[PDB]
Assembly symmetry: D2
Homo-oligomer: 115 residues x 4
């Protein structure tokens, strides 16, 4: 698992469950091509997005559909989605976790890149 | 001043100065049209992006050039940029401040929205 | 103004108004002596805590009353308060702004430090 | 494991390893009594702090010794330590994770409370 995503809810202090996540890779013409997607699990995680084979160096965008998450809970959100855009570089450690902490009018995101 | 951006640096404990910021508005054809841009001042603030007249209803993307910022300071960053995407003004004009706190492998952003 | 505090609310997208803040200074006997306190204004800011004269070298604890804030707004919070502990002025006077962003089960804080 | 602590480094995008963590419980006289402590592991985690038996309702303070962490890495920090102070309440879910994300002049902390 070269790429994993973890999403938490700062209002309830819980995983953010069943949140849609779409990953895209930047194509030669600068457009964003779909690459992987899924919904977070009961633990706020999303595994099995890719394989080492498909996960080549490039620029990637992770879009987390936070607006749908909050609206379904009856809480008015500010963002359309949260976005994380980064270059994957084979020079550093192998595994990337993209963690996001959601509030209705804020979010934070960190990357943990380990071997 | 209906859209402002404030950017802080969590490594140095300072405003993030001379950070490029681009704002785009989603067009009828789902492409991202340029809308406004500028650079943060010595206080980490960016005013003057737009006017109540120009800042119509719409989906806007504020993209903060975090990677150039960290590279200028000599520090290896993870993200290409930090993006904040939101629907604006759909119940009338509001004033938006978008604040972001930057670290090399993390950032946060928040919005403060007031009704004029 | 050598110590200021700014507090934002990440649920409402607004400044956090009327938030109580207490500052303590560590005493020679390792107890926390009261130093200054006040409440955030309509802009989420708190000025006037102290003066360059009174703000001597020392270890300070800034405690922001997040629990009362969330309880007033009708929202169940996790923390008792948010605490920021730091050595101040040990190479001469500096100006400190302590910014905090509040959610019911999370908060962040950052310092901006400038040399006068 | 009723209480776990997870610490990440926002400068390197990695777990914050070998960081000292001390937990205290507020005593009847308002003083802080030691309760548990340890150092984070290679994964930035710290398990086995307490048992359900000792972890009763009360007010707890988690102090994470961030100044020692940064100074050893040659990076000048602002805080003495990061502190998380909260009441444990048996009314909600059982397990508490206290997560902290460290930068030299900032930190964020969240709690994930699950069953």
């Amino acid at each position: 698992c070269p790429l994993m995503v973890k999403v938490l809810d700062a209002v309830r202090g819980s995983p953010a469950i069943n949140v849609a996540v779409h990953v895209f890779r930047k194509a030669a013409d600068d457009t964003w091509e779909p690459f992987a997607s899924g919904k977070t699990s009961e633990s706020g995680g999303l595994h099995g997005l890719t394989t080492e084979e498909e996960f080549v160096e490039g620029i990637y965008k992770v879009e987390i559909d936070t607006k749908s998450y909050w609206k379904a809970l009856g809480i008015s959100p500010f963002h359309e989605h949260a976005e994380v855009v980064f270059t994957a570089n084979d020079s550093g450690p192998r595994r990337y976790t993209i963690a996001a902490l959601l509030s209705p009018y804020s979010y934070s995101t960190t990357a943990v890149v380990t071997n």
